[PDB]
Amino acid sequence: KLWDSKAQGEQEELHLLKGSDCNLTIDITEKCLRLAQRSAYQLHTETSATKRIQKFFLLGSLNINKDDRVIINIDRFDPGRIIDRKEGNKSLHVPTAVIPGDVIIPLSMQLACLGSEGVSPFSISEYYDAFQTLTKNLKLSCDSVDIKDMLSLKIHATYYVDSDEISINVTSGVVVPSALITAVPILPVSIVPTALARSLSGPQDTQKSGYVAINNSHNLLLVLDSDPKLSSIPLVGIWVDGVISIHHPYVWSACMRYLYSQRLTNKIRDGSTGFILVLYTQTRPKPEFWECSFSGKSDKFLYCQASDDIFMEKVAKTRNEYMRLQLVPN
């Protein structure tokens, strides 16, 4: 045995939305929706044979509240640019300017023909391809763990304009990995007191994470997520700093990242054997140790949509009105 796996506390079940009661909240500022409708109507009037389906992007920020409540605050519309790689004749549709920290939400909107009770948001023809691309990015990324790389959200909006007001039915849908991480508190393991370990047990509310290596003396060495030795060094887990508890969604995101990464080719401890998590919480001077395991289906995902009507005055009252959407999964 590489270390002692005896449980020192209650088991915990990890998932992205566990702390948030499986609920994902979306707040969209009525101003950015109004800009989206304006652009859609211009497009819809610039050509007459093309059916009215506009292609835009919305831009948001990811925020996590007092009680681990995940909220996406979408407040910027960006019509986007078209670029041509010349691989295929069809031109490509891309956001205007991808900002680091921006949640990119593809926005499709169309004027409803007569009446559409059935709502199909984030259809499989486009959402499915987008989510395949998303998980492909999640498998190969070398960057720090980012909660934004863990979900793919799209919005379909059906709108109508009359002389008095603009009315819009907004259906917003998201997909995300379903994997639950089983976590068991375990007894502390000796860590080589390197400079990283000393700075880690020391004192900003910025999350950071890394990976866990082992040396000849069977002592644990903490490693940065940017260390080039990671490609073949034997890895047994991760370290995470800067959260209040294990229920913070950043922890589930880091666990998923460790399990999925194919840049780490020497993961001698994984989900079947159990791997180590060194958690440097903000409420304790020393880290907590957990053994994590997973045994279910690897490529299964959670998804859902929400929809609501909104009625807007033609004149944008100088308010900060917004629309709140929740998560109602299948």
TrEMBL record:
Domain STIL N-terminal residues, every copy:
2-329
Classify the source by domain of life.
Eukaryota
**Name of this chain's protein:** STIL N-terminal domain-containing protein
